[PDB]
Amino acid sequence: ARSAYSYIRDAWKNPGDGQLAELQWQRQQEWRNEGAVERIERPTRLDKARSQGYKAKQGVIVARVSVRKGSARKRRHKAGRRSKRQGVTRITRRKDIQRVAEERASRTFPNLRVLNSYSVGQDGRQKWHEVILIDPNHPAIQNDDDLSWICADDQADRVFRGLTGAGRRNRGLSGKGKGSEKTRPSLRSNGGKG
Amino acid sequence: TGAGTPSQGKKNTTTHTKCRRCGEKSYHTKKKVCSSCGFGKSAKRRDYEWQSKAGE
Amino acid sequence: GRRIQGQRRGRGTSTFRAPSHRYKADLEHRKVEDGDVIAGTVVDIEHDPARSAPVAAVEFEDGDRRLILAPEGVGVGDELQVGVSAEIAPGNTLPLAEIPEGVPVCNVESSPGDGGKFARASGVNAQLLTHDRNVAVVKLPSGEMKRLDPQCRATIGVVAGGGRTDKPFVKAGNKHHKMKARGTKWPNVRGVAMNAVDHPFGGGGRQHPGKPKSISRNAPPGRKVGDIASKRTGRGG
């Protein structure tokens, strides 16, 4: 039979319809008065969180992060530039808002490591994402056969190096064949052409 | 008044002093920032890639 | 070219800033809950460096010593009242609803409880005209009919220091001293006397503007100089 989780999933397929439409209209009023990074005891989307790797265990932290909507907040050139490089308005950043949210969360929690993240909506001027972070030093996580991989030294600052899920997708590593000639194994090895 | 020799006579102000962090006489005692190692500005030591030739 | 003087202003550097550390008080109306039972005695009459007009020192019933925007005629010993049931005497502050029509008023609020925005300069006054349950029409010193909320507070009388504009500065030094107390760069060099690099009107073998002086509203900072969006120019016609 269907899990209770499947109903949280089905509700979030259309966040502008049903009971969720009313819920988000209410919640966002409280969220807009909240900070940049807010630690929350329980995830707003349980199904998505558990699907991404969350466990109701010690050393597993969740945090909601708000990042602004739109393109790059770029300064106009202060010296000689050819027409192609004279733009300000139409320039967008190469990292998506989700990735920015994950980094801001990881900074607030210097000891923890980013496991994953998901969208929890947006209004007219900002986007909210909930980031699942893990304590690599807590023995509750060091003994977990499903999460102890994140404890390894090479997993230190994994978000800042693009090793996160949203990182790998934004780096164009999804496809294993056609189109990923300049993305795999890294953007930098391929001369930054990805 | 000339900008050369007669304007040099007013130079008795102490700015750059021996730094607590690096030991160079680059700690600006008015700005409280070191021009050599970046003490007072950053925790990380001041270093730049232009301090050497590009392929070195 | 180089950024014009009006662009250097916005950066808010020392030269363009007001000597705030030399200013006395931010003359706002007192905060009452209701009941009106707040009155005070005028202790001193001081000079206000910010507006070149006098200001009155008042000591209230609840032990609060605050400087108030002095209307004409207010002296030491006089009792001033602030609130709804306040007496309709010069120097008292009450909402526009309680003040009778045809009475000269000053230090008028824009939104109720803001402390006063309009009619504050030397010798000026706002004129309360029409009453309603929704709107209080006040005629501001510029001649504009401002429709306001009757709950907006105001002080009865004209502002003190009237006729300041009547006497000439005579010499540059007198202007210098006044300007040193304000947030303005003085003296004024004409754009037409500058180089092309410094101003839109700069350059040339003789002094004259390079294009017409009437600039569009849509003009960007660096170009918006001369006669800003003028509906007309000149005296005649």
């Binding site: 027409s83 192609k84 490089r85 004279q86 733009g87 139409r90 320039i91 | - | -």
Partner: protein
């Protein structure tokens, strides 16, 4: 100059002389779906667009003849080399 609307001449399709009808080549409408149209959309971005920033040139004082020679029997047309003419009016 004057030009006859209908006249006898060679038809490369029929391989024999037939009565042709002369018509001025009307400009066919553009679809906006050719490669050049897709390249205009692709290659145009911030600043100058190279070739796509150029505005169409002038005119020659007199244009050449742009005509279609339509066959009276088989109904097929053929093109010929044009000649400089300031005006071209048809007779009948």
């Amino acid at each position: 100059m004057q030009m006859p609307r209908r006249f006898n001449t060679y038809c490369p399709h029929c391989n024999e002389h037939q009565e042709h009808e002369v018509e001025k080549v009307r400009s066919g409408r553009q679809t906006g779906m050719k490669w050049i149209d897709r390249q205009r959309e692709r290659n145009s971005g911030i600043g100058n667009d190279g070739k796509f920033s150029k505005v169409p040139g002038g005119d020659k004082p007199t244009k050449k003849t742009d005509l279609k020679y339509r066959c009276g029997e088989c109904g097929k047309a053929h093109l010929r080399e044009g000649w400089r003419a300031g005006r071209l009016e048809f007779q009948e």
